[PDB]
Write a protein that binds this ligand. Structure first.
Ligand SMILES: Cc1c2[nH]c(c1CCC(=O)O)Cc1[nH]c(c(CCC(=O)O)c1C)Cc1[nH]c(c(CCC(=O)O)c1C)Cc1[nH]c(c(CCC(=O)O)c1C)C2
Ligand SMILES: Cc1c2[nH]c(c1CCC(=O)O)Cc1[nH]c(c(CCC(=O)O)c1C)Cc1[nH]c(c(CCC(=O)O)c1C)Cc1[nH]c(c(CCC(=O)O)c1C)C2
Lengths: 357, 357
């Protein structure tokens, strides 16, 4: 139903095969650092943008017109899942996401939709995925994505960003039962959503556990890890059952240094790394059979084009030329220079080829 | 809404009325042979230039500050239409236009936008037309333009220039149905685009069938001519319906010697000629009721100012002083001398007046 893929380097590396060079992409490659992103986004409010296949497709394509990135990622939000479960969410400029009525007690779970119906509420995402895959015309693979259960829970309880997650963690300690219930609702919504993304055309999937860092090992193993594992097991199972090829799945646990061994056993092809983990230490944690993605400090792009090249060279030396996809350790920041993102991409390609030959 | 036209000679001649002199313009009069064109163009990438009304207006005006040309043509590209249908196109300096993902099989037509929405994607062209018509302040008429369906198809399939059109012609012979489908998509996008150009201020329209020559009579009559005829019929119909004055339309089929009789019956006021067709033979083909445009070998401008004058004199003798707009037989080449373009313009004006008096 879709054009044949021309550059599959990203997929080959995700599965752990050898390639001629290291593939690269950037979290938030479609983002506010691009003037053209801001121009397209000035037309609608944020979630209206998410609900327009043409707008999502356009924002996805923009970075690919500037840089020879080895993957695209669909424009959407992780917060579409809580929204489709029935929570109201806003993204007013200057303030970040807010839920005006967060979940604060167990009884608040009653407001949520049955998780089995979330996928049908998210048809607009699938339309954006199909459109973008057709428009990409096989240039590079298209990544779909969602938030991990714990991270989604933090937003639902905290009502937005938090430096401590004190309310969400209070749920874990004081309301463990109701927490597991919410986390299971989330998992059961995520699975059919992620499956649907692949049915619509996604060629890989990333699960963002952006708030792993707040947990620590004991809480992470009890409350985050089981649902991370269940997402992967279930998504692969449903795809096989529907006659489709399962896709490479990436787990990105920001500030998750402490969980790398477990994440390596959690049924994901790729483990994404923040910039605080030394590549060689990550490699000792995860072993020889998963692919690593990352992990340059996004702020390194504030440095000169030449220094970026040298930092990239050092990073590639540490990861080595096997089982590795280059990216930053988090997303691009809004004040970053597009030319420096350009330099990061060119340096990965240049030094990875030098490192092989 | 616009200034009254001061010099309408070009329009009078297009409609076949007598004038005091022969009006002249040059394909690519805004082009790389002008140092000031290159300076304005060094600021942006090519399609960013196309999307800036001020930049398009400026490039349009430049040649008119050097030479008393009898028409302006808006700065744009024919390839904006395939781009607005959803194909990615580049114009890297030194390489010409490229589509990295050309159409290669019938199923690839699925990626394209509904042709009814192309005009709204091309609003920036209409903004450039309105701005330029206002800035011209009635000096001379402003021509809008587009590629003809077949020619646009060649780019979409071949992915760029070709000496044979072997892939595009393979479509015509092996995929006739899918070819007609593409050609109809193109026609249905072109019509509302061309209409929009006139709504925005265009005072005439040229359709460039630059790749006619590759066809020959049987394929041209089956695959190019029907859509050329449909463009004109439909554009005139929509303009009448909207309460506007239809504009003179020019069909330019480069290397189309073999189609001149049919082109004369295709509902265009003006038939443009390449330099390989002797003017008197063209006149026998098209009859007494269309206007001819052309047709000096662009390379003749490599000759001395004096020789250019003599070649122009011979050309004007052959066309005669009725139903004729002077131009070259194709566009100006980048290494041509602006003073020689100057001499071509002055010679047309001088000898056409001598030929009447
Ligand atoms: C994949 C994605 C996301 N957001 C957006 C996209 C699509 C564009 C892209 O690929 O980044 C658009 C996307 N999302 C947002 C923006 C900027 C909105 C604006 O102000 O106009 C855009 C373009 C806003 C946003 N959205 C979010 C925040 C963080 C809130 C906090 O904890 O303080 C913020 C600031 C939640 C969010 N959103 C996302 C994550 C996971 C990655 C990460 O950790 O950064 C998370 C945690 C993922
Ligand atoms: C009307 C127009 C066109 N292109 C451009 C304009 C505006 C300036 C002008 O009036 O010429 C800018 C215009 N278009 C281009 C340039 C030069 C770009 C650069 O290298 O910087 C400019 C100023 C590049 C171009 N664009 C095209 C080619 C030919 C490719 C091939 O078949 O080999 C090329 C080389 C496609 C094209 N473009 C156009 C045609 C029809 C006329 C013709 O046959 O020449 C065609 C066929 C029309």
């Amino acid at each position: 139903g879709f054009p044949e893929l021309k550059n599959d380097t990203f997929l080959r590396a995700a599965w752990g095969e050898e390639t001629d060079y290291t593939p690269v992409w950037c979290m938030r490659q479609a983002g506010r650092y691009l003037p053209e992103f801001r121009e397209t986004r000035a037309a609608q409010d944020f979630f209206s943008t998410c609900r327009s296949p043409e707008a999502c497709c356009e924002l996805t394509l923009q970075p690919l017109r500037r840089f020879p990135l080895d993957a695209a990622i669909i424009f959407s939000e992780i917060l579409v899942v809580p929204q489709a479960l029935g929570m109201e969410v806003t993204m007013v400029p200057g303030k970040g996401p807010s839920f005006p009525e967060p979940l604060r007690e167990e009884q608040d779970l009653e407001r949520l939709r049955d998780p089995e119906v979330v996928a049908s509420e998210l048809g607009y995402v699938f339309q954006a995925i199909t459109l973008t895959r057709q428009r990409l015309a096989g240039r590079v693979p298209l990544i779909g994505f969602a938030g991990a259960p714990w991270t989604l829970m933090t937003y639902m309880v905290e009502g937005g960003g938090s430096s401590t997650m004190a309310q969400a963690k209070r749920w874990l300690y004081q309301r463990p039962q109701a927490s597991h219930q919410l986390l299971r609702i989330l998992t059961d919504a995520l699975v059919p959503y992620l499956v649907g993304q692949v049915v619509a055309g996604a060629q890989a999937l990333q699960l963002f556990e952006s708030h792993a860092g707040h947990l620590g090992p004991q809480l992470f193993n009890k409350f985050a890890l089981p649902y991370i594992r269940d997402v992967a097991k279930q998504v692969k199972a449903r795809l096989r059952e529907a006659g489709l090829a399962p896709v490479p799945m990436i787990i990105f646990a920001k500030d998750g240094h402490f969980a790398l061994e477990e994440l390596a056993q959690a049924g994901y092809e790729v483990v994404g790394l923040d910039w605080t983990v030394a590549p060689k230490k990550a490699r000792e944690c995860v072993g020889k059979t998963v692919t690593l993605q990352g992990n340059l400090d996004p702020c390194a792009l504030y440095a000169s084009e030449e220094e970026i090249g040298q930092l990239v060279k050092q990073m590639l030396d540490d990861f080595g030329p096997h089982r590795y996809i280059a990216n930053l350790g988090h997303g691009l920041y809004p004040d970053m220079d597009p030319e420096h993102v350009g330099a990061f991409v060119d340096a990965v390609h240049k030094h990875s080829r030098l490192l092989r030959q």
